[PDB]
């Protein structure tokens, strides 16, 4: 068999500052735009209090891809982008990684490597206008498809026939923008819903924003478990004489393995080496002679 | 080369195994871990053969 020690204690460290941030400021908003404006907010520099979303039962399901929704409270991010656009709530299927659809081919595009949430839910009176709905309008067919996460502010009349349609609408000439004329007492099932996209960036920088988890103290000279802001591992932490330059956070070795770490609160240098393991070998004479054994830990 | 093959992706969404287990609980961790295991196993077999 194989031999390997188990950790005894566990340590979690991430920077001291918390600064509870207003997730709901984009949820309890004033007005929304259809497809042209979504304000590309950058909620960050805080602690992600995702508990504010699943405590209320008046929402749709956390139907999104990349991370298990219940696990969203134990991930540590770098930058979060919230997309605020509102579209029909019975047509809310085109917002998925790599799916077709007209709004999914000449409007907002999600990438095929979308590692973020697309949480969306109902809208009853806040979105639906009082005494007629004429403002929430979306642009019609475009020249071609658009690149993911790209704005489409530029507007111009499409020309494919003999008419440039420069204010001469009619007689085989069209203008994409038109008034819907939605009176209130209509098919509320057709009412647009609140659609938000919370993209995640697990790519570039050491983690900066994450939940209210509690930070313990430091343990030394012990095969230990640790979570220094994403840098998970199993090993022994001794203070090493590696002279970090200020901007440097992690440490890596010849074969691209994590080797040295600094504390996100105390700035102390530390390193990482696997705690002892190996194989176990049994030494014995033939069982026909005696039943004694000697054992070796490789 | 055998060591360097560990950092590769093989079609999953990440190479480090704990992070996969740190984002995805019930079946989808397993659908990714299938690809990870297949790739690593083939690399090991090749190494043993040479």
């Amino acid at each position: 068999s194989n031999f390997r020690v188990q950790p005894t204690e566990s340590i979690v460290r991430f920077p001291n500052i918390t600064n509870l941030c207003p997730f709901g400021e984009v949820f309890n908003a004033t007005r929304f735009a259809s497809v042209y404006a979504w304000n590309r907010k950058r909620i960050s520099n805080c602690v992600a209090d995702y508990s504010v979303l699943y405590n209320s039962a008046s929402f749709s399901t956390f139907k999104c891809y990349g991370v298990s929704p219940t696990k969203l409270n134990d991930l540590c991010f770098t930058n979060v982008y919230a997309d605020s656009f509102v579209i029909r709530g019975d047509e809310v299927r085109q917002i998925a990684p790599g799916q077709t659809g007209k709004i999914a081919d000449y409007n907002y595009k999600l990438p095929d490597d979308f590692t973020g949430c697309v949480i969306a839910w109902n809208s009853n009176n806040l979105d639906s206008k009082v005494g007629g709905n004429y403002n929430y309008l979306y642009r019609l067919f475009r020249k071609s498809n658009l690149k993911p996460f790209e704005r489409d502010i530029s507007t111009e009349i499409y020309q494919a026939g003999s008419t440039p349609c420069n204010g001469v609408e009619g007689f085989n000439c069209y203008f994409p923008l038109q008034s819907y004329g939605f009176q209130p007492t209509y098919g509320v099932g057709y009412q647009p819903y609140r659609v938000v996209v919370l993209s995640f960036e697990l790519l570039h920088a050491p983690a900066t924003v994450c939940g209210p988890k509690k930070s313990t103290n430091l343990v030394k000279n012990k095969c230990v478990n640790f979570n220094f802001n994403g840098l998970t591992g199993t090993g022994v932490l001794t203070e090493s004489n590696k002279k970090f330059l200020p901007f440097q956070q992690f440490g890596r070795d010849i074969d691209d393995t994590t080797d040295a770490v600094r504390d996100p609160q105390t700035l102390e240098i530390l390193d990482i080496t696997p705690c002892s393991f190996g194989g176990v070998s049994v030494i014995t004479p033939g069982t026909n002679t005696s039943n004694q054994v000697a054992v070796l830990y490789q | 080369t055998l060591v360097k093959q560990l950092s590769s992706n093989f079609g999953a969404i990440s190479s480090v195994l704990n992070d996969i287990l740190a984002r995805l609980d019930p079946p989808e961790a397993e659908v990714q871990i299938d690809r990870l295991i297949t790739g690593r196993l083939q690399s090991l077999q090749t190494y043993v053969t040479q």
Binding site: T257, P274, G278, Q298 | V3
Partner: peptide, 24 residues
């Protein structure tokens, strides 16, 4: 130093890990 000769000394001087891997 050990027990070797001049030639064997030249011969040794002339010739110059726990993520699963092990060395016996």
């Amino acid at each position: 130093p050990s027990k070797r000769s001049f030639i064997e000394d030249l011969l040794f001087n002339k010739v110059t890990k726990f993520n699963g891997l092990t060395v016996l």
